[PDB]
Swiss-Prot record, chain A:
One of its GO terms (molecular function) is proton-transporting ATPase activity, rotational mechanism. F-type ATPases have 2 components, F(1) - the catalytic core - and F(0) - the membrane proton channel. F(1) has five subunits: alpha(3), beta(3), gamma(1), delta(1), epsilon(1). F(0) has four main subunits: a(1), b(1), b'(1) and c(10-14). The alpha and beta chains form an alternating ring which encloses part of the gamma chain. F(1) is attached to F(0) by a central stalk formed by the gamma and epsilon chains, while a peripheral stalk is formed by the delta, b and b' chains. It comes from the Eukaryota. Belongs to the ATPase B chain family. It comes from Spinacia oleracea (Spinach). Its main location: plastid. Coiled coil: none annotated. Keywords: ATP-binding, CF(0), Chloroplast, Hydrogen ion transport, Ion transport, Membrane, Nucleotide-binding, Plastid, Thylakoid, Transit peptide, Transmembrane, Transmembrane helix, Transport. GO terms for biological process: proton motive force-driven ATP synthesis. It is found in: Plastid, Chloroplast thylakoid membrane. The chain holds residues 112 to 167 of 222 of the full protein. GO terms for cellular component: chloroplast thylakoid membrane; proton-transporting ATP synthase complex. The keyword Transport applies. This is ATP synthase subunit b', chloroplastic.
Curated annotation (Swiss-Prot), chain B:
Its main location: plastid. HAMAP family: ATP_synth_a_bact. This is ATP synthase subunit a, chloroplastic. Pfam families: ATP-synt_A. It is a multi-pass membrane protein. Keywords: ATP synthesis, CF(0), Chloroplast, Hydrogen ion transport, Ion transport, Membrane, Plastid, Thylakoid, Transmembrane, Transmembrane helix, Transport. F-type ATPases have 2 components, CF(1) - the catalytic core - and CF(0) - the membrane proton channel. CF(1) has five subunits: alpha(3), beta(3), gamma(1), delta(1), epsilon(1). CF(0) has four main subunits: a, b, b' and c.
Amino acid sequence: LGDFMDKRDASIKEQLSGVKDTSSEVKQLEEQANAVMRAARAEISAALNKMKKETQ
Amino acid sequence: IHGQVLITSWVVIAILLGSAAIAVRSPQTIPTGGQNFFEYVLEFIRDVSKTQIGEEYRPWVPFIGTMFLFIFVSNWSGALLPWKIIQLPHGELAAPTNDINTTVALALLTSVAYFYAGLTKKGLGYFGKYIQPTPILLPINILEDFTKPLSLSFRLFGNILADELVVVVLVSLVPLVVPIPVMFLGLFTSGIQALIFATLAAAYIGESLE
């Protein structure tokens, strides 16, 4: 009986806690990914600036 | 055997054995009416155990919840069960706790429980009885070791047996219209003293574990 009750409690607790921690991890993922996004964007447009200045 | 208690204690233990299967009968993640009481009582075990025992509260969750819920169902069989008409020539039909032996059994169970914890988790050679804080505290060891189990039991047992007698002592004179606040106060305090035996058991385990 203790197994069954603690088991359903552990089910709901486990799923909610995993939800919250993966949410934090994917938030870290978006911050890092958009940082590298605008960094690579600066890199490509900087290659444009480089080719402009070089042909200049 | 002491029959007058054993006969009714058998059907109360039957109620217990059925509540043992009540776990595996209905699985509800969100328990509606009735089973939410089961989850709340499990939470209550969590409370008292984590508050008083300490770390290994969970393998002692069974040993505390059994006496707690058993005093609960025995209060049920004592008062709330309709038993006016039934008649037994062997003795009064009140509760499993009518005999001294059930309460001294719970006593020895709690005693050997904290003794087991204090011998395994601490050293086998010496436990809290060994006179470490002040070597002239042997009377404290003798007295506490000798007084904990029996009066630990007596605390519950006195009130429960007292009301189990008082109900029929009242009905013998006046019909049930008068004794009903007495039934009320009894159903009030019988679960409190259940909690009390539970929390004192838990405190003795915590003493053994510290």
